[PDB]
From a paper:
Gorilla bocavirus 1 ([name]) is a member of the genus Bocaparvovirus in the Parvoviridae that contain single-stranded DNA (ssDNA) packaging viruses.
The [name] capsid structures were identical, despite being assembled from different VP compositions. They share the conserved features of the Parvoviridae subfamily, with a channel at the 5-fold symmetry axis, protrusions around the 3-fold axis, the 2/5-fold wall, located between the depressions at the 2- and 5-fold axes and depressions at the 2-fold as well as around the 5-fold axis. The basket-like structure beneath the 5-fold channel previously reported within the capsids of HBoV1-HBoV4 and BPV, was less pronounced in [name] suggesting less order at the N-terminus of the VP. In both the [name] structures, excluding residues 1–32, residue 33 to the last C-terminal residue, aa542 (VP3 numbering), were structurally ordered and models could be built into the cryo-reconstructed density maps. The [name] VP3 structure conserved the parvovirus features, including the eight-stranded β-barrel motif, α-helix A and β-strand A. The structure also featured α-helix B, a region unique to the bocaparvoviruses and the ten defined VRs, VR-I to VRVIIIB and VR-IX. In addition to the high-resolution WT structure, the structures of two capsid-antibody complex structures are reported, highlighting antigenic epitopes on the [name] capsid surface. The 12C1 epitope sits on the protrusions around the 3-fold axis and contains contact residues from VR-I (80-SNGN-83), VR-IV (276-IRQNGQTTA-284) and VR-VIII (390-NQTT-393).
Residue numbers in the entry:
A (entry chain A), B (entry chain B): 33 to 542
C (entry chain I): 237 to 440
D (entry chain I): 33 to 134
E (entry chain I): 492 to 542
F (entry chain G): 288 to 338
């Protein structure tokens, strides 16, 4: 039946591998609490050491489910088998369920806090599938579902940047701001999730959401040679190379050597030319993408009217550690420990470089723009990467290849928003008084993954991801990677190869 | 199914625009508590500084839903689009739902108060659609549903004026009052909402109410010229003007000038002649509508046996600030801050004046009564106005045009009354003892709005409501109008045009 | 007699919308990021490895294309544009400058914010207008997909990149056309072309 | 019927707004005269102050209708309403008529 | 929140007698031209867009 | 703008005139090398021969 004593779902988990598809199933226990005391608020974060960088933030009384990472949908076993056995994969269909909800009242009698459920209390659930509201999720956020199925998932408050602050900040000689800055505030949108229709559930209820992906494949393959090596060294070429007079060397006309043939295929795009600009508390990137309408007043540097573009490097080989993708494996990691620095996948469509001859030597071209006949592989994503990102709605765009490796889509999976229904309290003083409550429940995500198995005429063995590439750590230093410790600590991958990137194992004939 | 752990509704919100209709959807979380300790009481409010003004008030153990304002049914975005894109609109159908009810018991153990729900407790809901009881709502009350969907709605106690007090007050030389005043008390009606059949709901239940409007349109259009300018200046007129002898000027007979033709259309009605009478604690209006049967004893002035008629001015141009419509934007506003003074809509069917020649000059006619051939536009309502008012049941009436702009109807939307069901407590002393409880729940209002799009042969652009007409305020003074502040404070419109009145944007050929 | 002519358009939309934020602001400031920023040693400042601040997240979306680097070349009676697109086959004799074997490319600026009045779209409203009267200078639409800029850090400050070519992951809005604009233009017949986005706003 | 004293058309004008389409109608009185005395000619414009810039121009005994601007198809009222009420627009079908010739 | 729209209040006044508003005819019959770019009513101004 | 120079919307196609060939003729001599240089490799040569 249905009621308070009947569960609305069950635990779903594991994976199913087939030839043409993989089904991953993940359930988590999540917790949500009241945010902003049921208020919408617009705050200005303006760090003193932020070197003039600022944000406007509308914080909402809402929290949201973020499913975007690979590690949350794949065990390390399943990710290994995925990247070892398949040439490519993409998401096919997502199904998420929120069920087994429990709304407890929080009673503070003192230092001791007690918990008893309000059976008539309720919870708001809203999935935004048309992206009618500012997107909650962003790639590489820590809000994502946990990797370990038995770890609790704590939802993060939803907030959005209503405006670019330095454009709206009403600073300058004139009082009240310039005419252009005021015009940019006079229209600053304000979004409330309460403006949409959505669901209110009690403990005996549940909700489910389906999403259909239509996506480009994630290709797991490596180029064993660059596109320039695709010729045959033994056959001569008809091509002639003329070399102009250089100093005392006479100009010559000769047949190009058989072992260097000319290539038609350029280095992929990328920027090696920029450099990060401290301090670390500002936005530090080799490149800022800025918007600066005419008539605004800017008292800061490029950071703070613009966003840092990172990784700047494309398929180009990073010439410095600043250009490499890097992330901390846990939220408690700081400094040089817990960080994973990306290393080459040893694919020959990656780590490209472009040199121009000055007729003496070749010198590196740092900034490689889009140019015809460019051939490159997209970034070698690992088990920890964002799966997707939100593609901005715009008139025009170039080739969409986010350098972090996430897949940009017009409509990604919609964000499911959840908040505690407000339970007002009588107040003789007309104060705003609500009952303190929280919801815990079980959220499951089933994703169907369309996959393709490789076929190779290669005679020789190929690289595969092996547990022998794992490292040993822990409190007692006996615990291998992706295993729990004596304290229950989950041993994180130390290095980029332990994250099992794609575009490593399976060779590819160009 | 149905029960304590199953929600009886969901959150509905937003708007839907079409050509011939607009659907607005609004849900609020409301709270109600016990009123008058479950008693009916008749109180006499007789302020010492009220300058002899008094009221009889029957206060009831009831609270009521008030949906009458435009701002509660329209976001400022939706109101803008309504008044920019449509020549006229009226309400079509209302649907309200009370659901997701929670009755909590209030436990006071000390300075600390605890809240736990009584699942078998219940709540009375009564909609009066025949207006069999004194109307709860009145235009420009603060009891109305909030503008922000996430703000809690606190219901107000229902009460009504049983009688005009100075007529019933039994004052005079004779003891016990005159014969006429006693006769006016001997019949003073007394109304109990318990006399009607109505619904009692528990948490697992819900109720809904439908109402069908049949209304006059709210016309959003402006006259670019007065009705007197409707002639052609270049064609001569046949009309003759005779001017009698004035002093040493000889009487003349001549053809009226082509650029002044006579008009058939009089100034609309209005009173510029009255003045408010202090102090502010009495009823201060330029005009009192009084009832004074013969045989009553009146020891006071006109105020207190009568009601102030405000705005006194009709379509007539207010000659003083006293004659202008004015309101505070929030309940905490006092004095000169937070008040919005109405300003001209620059429609030429508004701000009318009437002068009579004394044969030397023209002098203003202050009081313009109904006269044949009068042409005027009804008040330019804003997003904050009452939508409707209750029209009194009476034998005879003149043209119904409330000067505040609210639409008078024989039957407006019925008032939904709600109170906490009394939960008596055993008392050995035969005291009246009840259990202290309150109800919070979700109330939704869907209104279908019949609309009409304008068509114009005007070549030139027309005025529209723009966000660039908004102003910037807040604690940090960075927050634009209709946006939330850092504290969560909602920035109120400072001026009358920011309230986006009608009869401004869309020109009209007379 | 009389004649009539019908034509059927198949066209891209003219989009009337504004971005209230740039594509770089699409994150949530309150949630932390996993991303690490390594800053190399600069002078006496030590190299540091730290978590990127929550209020600056890295963006995947580059500034749209444009040229801020060129400048018009007088006199006004020649072809004066920041850029000449020229054709110069081998064997021709050219006794002139770049103007006159080539055509001026104007507006040079893309979605990039014009850094000078030369880069702004400008026209006279009537055929009799001359000089500084009757001219309409384009001003920002206050859309955040317009007026873009690109800076590269030298590890001390950020310096403007004047010429922004096509680069992957670029996001921009097409020019904010007005009631006086060409609706369409003729697209040249050619083998190859890049993204077609005439900077005046006309639809090729 | 048809002849010298029968008009071949009428004045069409205005706009019609709907949800999914807008119809703009514009009629003009046009004038054309003889060009180049009925000759094709190839002229070289080579301004002395043109700083070496020149053009070859084939001028024809022909004139042409140019409909390409937005302001010619939209009144300022209609353009306002277009840009206020709609997120996007594109041309769908054009129909032009030359008639009432003298 | 409300959004920007094109308004006749953004027009300017000019003419021979300087009484004629934009997009209106003058005493001579001269049609008053838009002085500034916003009076030409550009697109990508009024209607906000969620990216 | 003069009637005989109108602004053009159409840019020059792509190309590289900036590079120069690097002798001797027995090596790979081109104005530009497209190279692949993964991190951790050892290169004792110039751009030619890893590209």
């Amino acid at each position: 039946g249905s009621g308070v004593g009947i569960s609305t779902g069950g635990w779903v988990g594991g994976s199913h591998f087939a030839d043409k598809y993989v089904i991953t199933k993940n359930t988590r226990q999540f917790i949500t609490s009241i945010q902003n005391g049921h208020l919408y608020k617009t705050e200005i974060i303006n760090p003193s050491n932020g070197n003039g960088k600022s944000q406007r933030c509308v914080t909402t009384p809402w929290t949201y489910f973020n499913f975007n990472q690979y590690s949350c949908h794949f065990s390390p076993q399943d990710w290994q088998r995925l990247t070892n056995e398949y040439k490519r994969f993409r998401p096919k269909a997502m199904l998420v369920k929120i069920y087994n909800l429990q709304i407890k009242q929080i009673l503070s009698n003192g230092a001791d806090t007690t918990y008893n459920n309000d059976l008539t209390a309720g919870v708001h659930i809203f999935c935004d599938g048309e992206h009618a509201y500012p997107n909650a999720s962003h790639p590489w956020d820590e809000d994502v579902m946990p990797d370990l199925p038995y770890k609790t998932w704590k939802l993060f408050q939803y907030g959005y940047i209503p405006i670019l602050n330095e454009l709206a900040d009403l600073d300058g000689t004139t009082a009240g701001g310039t005419a252009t800055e005021k015009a940019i505030l006079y229209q600053m949108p304000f979004f409330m999730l309460e403006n949409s229709d959505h669901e209110v559930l009690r403990t005996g209820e549940s909700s489910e959401f389906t999403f259909n992906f239509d996506c480009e494949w994630v290709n797991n393959e490596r180029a064993y040679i660059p596109p320039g090596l695709m010729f045959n060294p033994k056959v001569p070429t008809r091509r002639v190379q003329y070399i102009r007079q250089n100093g005392q060397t006479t100009a010559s006309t000769s047949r190009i050597e058989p072992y260097s043939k000319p290539t038609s295929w350029m280095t992929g795009p990328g920027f090696l030319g920029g450099q990060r600009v401290g301090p670390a508390t500002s936005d530090t990137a080799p490149y800022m993408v800025c918007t600066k309408p005419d008539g605004v007043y800017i008292n800061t540097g490029a950071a703070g009217y613009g966003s840092g573009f990172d990784p700047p490097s494309g398929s180009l080989a990073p010439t410095d550690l600043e250009y490499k993708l890097q992330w901390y494996q846990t939220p408690e990691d700081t400094g040089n420990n817990g960080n994973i620095i990306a290393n080459p996948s040893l694919s020959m469509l990656r780590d490209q470089l472009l040199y121009r001859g000055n007729q003496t030597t070749y010198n590196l071209n740092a900034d490689v723009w889009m140019f015809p006949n460019q051939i490159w592989d997209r970034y070698p994503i690992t088990r920890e990467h964002p799966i997707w990102c939100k593609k901005p709605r715009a008139d025009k765009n170039t080739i969409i290849d986010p350098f972090d490796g996430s897949i940009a889509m017009d409509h990604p999976p919609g964000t499911i928003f959840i908040k505690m229904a407000k339970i007002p309290v009588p107040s003789s003083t007309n104060a705003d008084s609500y009952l303190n409550i929280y919801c815990t429940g079980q959220v499951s995500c089933e994703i169907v993954w369309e996959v393709e198995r490789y076929v190779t005429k290669n005679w020789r063995p190929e690289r595969r991801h092996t547990a022998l590439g794992m490292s040993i750590g822990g409190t007692e230093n006996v615990s291998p990677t992706y295993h729990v410790d004596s304290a229950g600590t989950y041993i994180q991958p130390t290095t980029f190869d332990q994250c099992m990137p794609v575009k490593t194992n399976i060779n590819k004939v160009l």
